[PDB]
Symmetry: D2
Subunit: 104 residues, 4 copies
Amino acid sequence: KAEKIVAVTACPVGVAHTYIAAKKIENEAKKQGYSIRVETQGSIGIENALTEEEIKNASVVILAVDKDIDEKRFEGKRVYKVSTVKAINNTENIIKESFNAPVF
Amino acid sequence: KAEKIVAVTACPVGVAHTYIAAKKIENEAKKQGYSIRVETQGSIGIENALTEEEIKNASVVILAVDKDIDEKRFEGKRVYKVSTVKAINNTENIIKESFNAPVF
Amino acid sequence: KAEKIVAVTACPVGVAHTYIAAKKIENEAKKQGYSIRVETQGSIGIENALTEEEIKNASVVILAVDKDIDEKRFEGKRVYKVSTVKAINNTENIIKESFNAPVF
Amino acid sequence: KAEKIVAVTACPVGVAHTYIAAKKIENEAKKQGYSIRVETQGSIGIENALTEEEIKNASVVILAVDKDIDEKRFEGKRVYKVSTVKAINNTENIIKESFNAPVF
Ligand SMILES: [Cl-]
């Protein structure tokens, strides 16, 4: 069973950075062989929220956020938090680096 | 006095096409020597709406829109209506062609 | 076995509408119980291109495009062509309507 | 004479945040009665670059950037540096705050 990544992308300007970060993370995760679920947030709201079970099963959590989100749900997980710009422009490296991220 | 252009940009996805079309139109109008006022319509709302006096004084109206907007206000003006994609990727030509656009 | 949908999203402004349409189609196809493969075309290039076998096995082809793409590879399939804006904002209905789309 | 503001906007994801922040700053500066010049930096390159004279005459420099830019040209000026997201969503306060920003 391929390891699982979960991610949240959140930019409170329109929808573009939220969705670009999500889709680039999804494409790069799959290229590297991982399963991926992404929750997205904008200024209006939240779509496809991570479930408790999804977070439980994940090897890593990647947060590509330009606003504060709830992070208590990720306690005990390795969490790699970056801006949406970095997630969009450095996606390959961010996926790889997330597996060495500190436990939150 | 330089001739005046008024424009509306309107895309019902987030804010990016609305603002990219607006800024590209503004930059190209100024490059060609024209005065420009742009009303924008996106997910944050309608901003900087054209006034009746601005429309009265304009030489042309450019509509870069992917949704319906109020158009009765442009009766009697030359109106050049295009998609946001065309306004963004063909900005120089759209400015030039607007002066030959049909009277609405 | 779930029926299969294939899609191409293609907006020639950056990558935002291409990726937003792709994610909206992916999530909504899955919600309706379908298997889904989306090829994307944007400024970054073409990604996750449909294979000949994927097109062969699909029940329908959804083209969410704001530019012409060669449709020869979809001959003999039902093809539902819509703008990226409509695919992003009307996704549930577009997936349902695609099964009644004309054969190309 | 109205006091002068100069700004640079620079988000290295396409052109959207660069242009949205530029238009927000331009419109809000004008609303507050200031003269405003904005240089933009995006995937298309640098547009409407500030001149030495414009920087000399400015009361404040606002940098709405999501990457490092060379700041030597702003020495001796009050410089207020914020992200593009904050410039877009908090424009009124950022313009007012810039006049108390530290001299660079
Ligand atoms: Cl957007």
